[PDB]
Amino acid sequence: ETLNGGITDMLTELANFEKNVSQAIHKYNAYRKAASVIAKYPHKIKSGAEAKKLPGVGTKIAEKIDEFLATGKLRKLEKIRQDDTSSSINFLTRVSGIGPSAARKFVDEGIKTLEDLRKNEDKLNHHQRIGLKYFGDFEKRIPREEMLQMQDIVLNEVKKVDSEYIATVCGSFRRGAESSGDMDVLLTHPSFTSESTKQPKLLHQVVEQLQKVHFITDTLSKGETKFMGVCQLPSKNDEKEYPHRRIDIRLIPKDQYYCGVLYFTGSDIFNKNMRAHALEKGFTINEYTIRPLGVTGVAGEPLPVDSEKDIFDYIQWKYREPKDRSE
DNA sequence: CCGACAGGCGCATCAG
DNA sequence: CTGATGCGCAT
DNA sequence: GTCGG
Ligand SMILES: [Mg+2]
Ligand SMILES: [Mg+2]
Ligand SMILES: [Mg+2]
Ligand SMILES: [Mg+2]
Ligand SMILES: [Mg+2]
Ligand SMILES: [Mg+2]
């Protein structure tokens, strides 16, 4: 498919190994950073030296690229692919709620297959049990046509609960993607600000309404501001059912919507890059605020923010529309 | 060369 | 029980 | 694994 697709596939597979098997989060991030910068690079890479000029690509990745270019493979990966333990741990982490730690522990206890998981429900926590239940469905992508039907349901049902709610579909959907891995919904209500919560159960009431109409089907986790769960579009007579889909809802302080929507629009790599750039500039950005850093690494008071662009301006970045925050 | 690497919610668990 | 910590997850 | 001080 893609211009340096071989290289970026290699690097992403190395990232996953470092995260899932090595449990080295900074090496995972370093590989993902390199994969992203190479994926955006508009030339077919001819050497590692050429790749090394990109920020995030260093000596070790440049050497892997030289290997890959010459031979069409990487020995280091060819050996990870035949390592039984690595391969089993990597597979189990595909279940939502099983991470590197739980996968290694399962693999040590003799559980390394889907079949093994499916006769050991009792060793799984609630999240894992649901991740297993919908293992196949959760790896299917959601065409934009279906994302549009799902937006319509969520926005109309939210409006039924209280007309003052605003629900914004974020993630890859807001970035214009033709398909999405899941549905991300940012929610606000005027009664929840950074200064005051003057209504309880604001997130709960929306979740309950979506359960009532059979859109939300399962709950992975749920607190006062974050819901993680499962939903499904209604199917019509004699049609196969739609796959079950992952849904995330985040209730954000209304007056902090712009930091909220910046966060929830991503991409994840974009947010890391942006937040890392903020730190270089003497600021810290989360889903609520952008704050200056003081001398001794302590965060100051929130800066006024009136648009997404305001946050970009503070770190002296030219604005990027959501569609230009992908990959 | 070597600190630092994005930020935080919800859940599960440990020490007391 | 609270407070701390790690895990898995979200972008 | 990479990079800025
Ligand atoms: Mg470089
Ligand atoms: Mg997993
Ligand atoms: Mg998403
Ligand atoms: Mg994602
Ligand atoms: Mg999501
Ligand atoms: Mg059904």
The nucleotides of chain C lying under 7 Å from a protein CB are 6-11
- Give the ranges where chain A is alpha helix by DSSP (H): 5-17, 25-39, 48-52, 59-71, 75-82, 84-92, 100-108, 114-117, 126-133, 135-138, 144-161, 171-174, 202-212, 257-265, 268-281, 308-314
Resolution (A): 1.9
Q: Give the span between the Cα atoms of A174 and A92, in whole angstroms.
A: 30
Closest to A182 measured CA to CA, from A172, A193, A195, A194: A172
- The gap between A130 CA and C4 C1' (Å) is 28
The torsion angles phi and psi of A47, rounded to 5 degrees, stand at -160, 165
Q: How was this structure determined?
A: X-ray
CA angle in degrees (0–180, nearest 5) for A172-A263-A175: 25
DSSP letter for A21, please.
I
Among residues A92, A119, A118, A113, the alpha carbon closest in space to that of A104 is found at A92
**Residue A184 C-alpha to ligand 5 middle, in angstroms?**
5
Catalytic residue among A19, A33, A44, A64: A64
How close is the Cα of A28 to the center of ligand 6, in Å? 37
Kindly tell me the burial class for residue A237, based on how many C-beta atoms sit within 10 Å of its own C-beta (0-12, 13-18, 19 or more).
Answer: exposed
The spacing between the Cα labelled CA in A97 and the C1' in B11, in angstroms, equals 11
Residues 11-30 of A with CB under 7 A from strand D: 26-27, 29-30
Contact A65, A47 (CB under 8 A): yes
Q: Within 7 Å: CB of A280 and strand D?
A: yes
Burial environment of residue A301 by CB neighbours within 10 A (0 to 12, 13 to 18, 19 or more)? exposed
Helix (H, G, I), strand (E, B) or coil at A79: helix
Q: How far is the CA of A113 from the C1' of D5 (A)?
A: 48
Q: Does residue A64 carry a catalytic annotation?
A: yes
Contact criterion met (CB below 8 Å) for A219 and A229: yes
Q: Structural domains in chain A?
A: 1-83 (1.10.150.110), 84-140 (1.10.150.20), 141-263 (3.30.460.10), 264-326 (no CATH)
Using alpha carbons, select from A275, A292, A274 the residue that is nearest to residue A283.
Answer: A292
- Strand B nucleotides with an atom less than 7 Å from a protein beta carbon: 4-12
User: A126-153 burial string, b = 16+ CB within 10 Å, else e?
Assistant: ebbbbbbbbeeebeebbeeebbeebbee
